[PDB]
Amino acid sequence: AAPVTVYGPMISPAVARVAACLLEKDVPFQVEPVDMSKGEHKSPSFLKLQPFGQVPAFKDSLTTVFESRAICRYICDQYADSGNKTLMGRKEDGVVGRAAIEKWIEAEGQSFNPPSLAMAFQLAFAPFMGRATDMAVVEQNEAKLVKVLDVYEQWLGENQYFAGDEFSLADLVHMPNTDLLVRKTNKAGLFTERKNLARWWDEVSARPSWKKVVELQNVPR
Amino acid sequence: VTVYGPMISPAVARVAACLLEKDVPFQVEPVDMSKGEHKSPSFLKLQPFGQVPAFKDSLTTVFESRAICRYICDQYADSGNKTLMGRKEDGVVGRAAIEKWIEAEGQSFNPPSLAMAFQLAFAPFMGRATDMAVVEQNEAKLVKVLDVYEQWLGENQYFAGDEFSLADLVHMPNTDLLVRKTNKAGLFTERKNLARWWDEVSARPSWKKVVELQ
Numbered sequence: 151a152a153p154v155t156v157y158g159p160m161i162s163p164a165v166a167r168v169a170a171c172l173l174e175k176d177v178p179f180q181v182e183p184v185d186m187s188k189g190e191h192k193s194p195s196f197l198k199l200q201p202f203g204q205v206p207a208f209k210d211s212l213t214t215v216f217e218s219r220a221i222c223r224y225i226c227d228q229y230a231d232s233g234n235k236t237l238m239g240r241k242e243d244g245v246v247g248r249a250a251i252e253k254w255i256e257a258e259g260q261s262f263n264p265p266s267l268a269m270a271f272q273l274a275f276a277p278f279m280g281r282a283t284d285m286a287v288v289e290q291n292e293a294k295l296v297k298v299l300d301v302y303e304q305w306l307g308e309n310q311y312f313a314g315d316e317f318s319l320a321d322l323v324h325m326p327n328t329d330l331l332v333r334k335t336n337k338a339g340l341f342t343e344r345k346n347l348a349r350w351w352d353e354v355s356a357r358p359s360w361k362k363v364v365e366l367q368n369v370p371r
Numbered sequence: 372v373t374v375y376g377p378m379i380s381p382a383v384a385r386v387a388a389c390l391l392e393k394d395v396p397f398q399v400e401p402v403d404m405s406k407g408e409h410k411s412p413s414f415l416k417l418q419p420f421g422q423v424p425a426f427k428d429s430l431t432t433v434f435e436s437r438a439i440c441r442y443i444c445d446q447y448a449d450s451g452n453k454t455l456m457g458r459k460e461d462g463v464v465g466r467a468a469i470e471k472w473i474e475a476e477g478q479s480f481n482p483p484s485l486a487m488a489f490q491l492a493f494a495p496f497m498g499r500a501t502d503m504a505v506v507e508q509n510e511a512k513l514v515k516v517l518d519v520y521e522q523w524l525g526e527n528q529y530f531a532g533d534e535f536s537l538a539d540l541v542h543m544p545n546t547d548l549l550v551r552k553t554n555k556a557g558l559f560t561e562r563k564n565l566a567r568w569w570d571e572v573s574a575r576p577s578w579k580k581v582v583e584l585q
């Protein structure tokens with residue numbers, strides 16, 4: 151079928167999250183650049199796709215969706231039979247299996263994302279935007295992040311992936327921010343020096359979907 | 372079906388409202404944090420973060436309010452309000468029309484509104500002084516969100532369109548907090564479409580029951 155469209159810069163964790171999901175589900179797509187320096191993401195035309203004036207925006211042959219995690223859920227259910235058929239769980243496990251995945255998707259959006267994103271902005275983006283890194287913000291959020299990682303470290307010592315024996319959207323949603331911290335800051339050790347998290351990252355970051363996302367991010371931002 | 376935690380917690384209230392709309396019988400089990408009951412190995416088995424609410428039924432256990440709500444809507448799809456997560460006829464597209472606003476609630480609406488509610492309605496009762504700088508900083512972020520909602524609700528009766536859904540429900544706990552427990556009710560009542568929306572959803576029997584339980 152014709153390629154669906156994701157709007158925004160690949161360096162954005164939210165945009166990368168959607169791209170990764172489309173790749174896992176083998177859904178042909180094209181990335182439409184949005185000139186944020188010219189405020190294109192705030193234009194009346196863009197607001198019809200994304201009411202909050204933020205990226206990414208998503209559109210396929212049937213509808214438009216906003217919010218990276220809602221977009222991902224849509225892709226997984228609309229194109230369930232494509233690519234990785236178990237991204238949102240094994241059919242055999244039904245709703246109970248989906249819940250085992252959803253709780254960690256929520257952990258990502260509610261506990262992991264806030265502090266990791268704050269850190270990433272201060273350390274990986276600010277330095278290139280003519281802004282000074284706020285060390286107080288970094289320190290405060292690192293403490294919050296470590297608390298979440300302690301929970302994950304314990305969990306991943308009893309589970310290969312967040313949902314157990316198989317990779318799922320639960321693992322995928324955590325990848326964009328983890329990649330940012332591991333590859334673009336000196337905080338990589340928070341992940342790579344913790345036995346279970348290190349194993350998990352080494353495994354998931356090697357998947358072809360993520361390898362392609364990294365390749366797509368090798369564009370000027 | 373057991374929900375662990377205090378009804379005053381908006382996260383617990385969110386789950387209760389969902390169970391009520393789905394007409395699923397349940398009991399609320401108190402979690403005494405002053406006794407460190409949220410840090411016991413038993414509670415941690417249900418909630419790895421030592422936070423509330425915790426949820427358990429005869430089939431499994433789930434944590435995080437929005438995940439618990441999605442589970443309830445899928446597992447008990449035929450109970451109570453059968454359209455809480457959309458109509459089968461509208462397919463996955465119909466589900467997405469709801470999901471995007473549930474995400475708006477969790478990512479854009481929740482952070483600033485919860486920060487405000489804490490400083491204004493909880494910090495005091497905890498012997499702490501209200502930090503008006505944090506309140507105002509978060510109010511600015513919330514206003515941006517409410518202005519988007521105000522425009523949307525001018526063309527839609529509910530977040531997903533002409534029918535009430537989980538997208539509306541997830542916004543209720545924090546809205547109730549600000550409207551009834553703080554001096555920030557004006558943020559909603561001054562915006563006609565948001566005011567209409569709130570007056571309508573807060574009148575639903577499920578929410579009236581949650582308020583009674585609180």
Ligand SMILES: N[C@@H](CCC(=O)N[C@@H](CS)C(=O)NCC(=O)O)C(=O)O
Nearest residue numbers: 162164203204205206217218219478
């Ligand atoms: N919570 C949304 C939004 C993500 C987000 O924060 N997008 C940023 C990427 S730079 C953005 O557009 N920022 C511009 C702004 O807020 O004006 C999601 O996960 O899709």
Ligand SMILES: N[C@@H](CCC(=O)N[C@@H](CS)C(=O)NCC(=O)O)C(=O)O
Nearest residue numbers: 260380382421422423424435436437
């Ligand atoms: N994001 C989770 C947890 C929400 C949350 O922060 N719950 C509070 C209710 S008081 C809590 O248990 N706080 C205790 C703590 O921070 O340890 C959800 O929606 O269930």
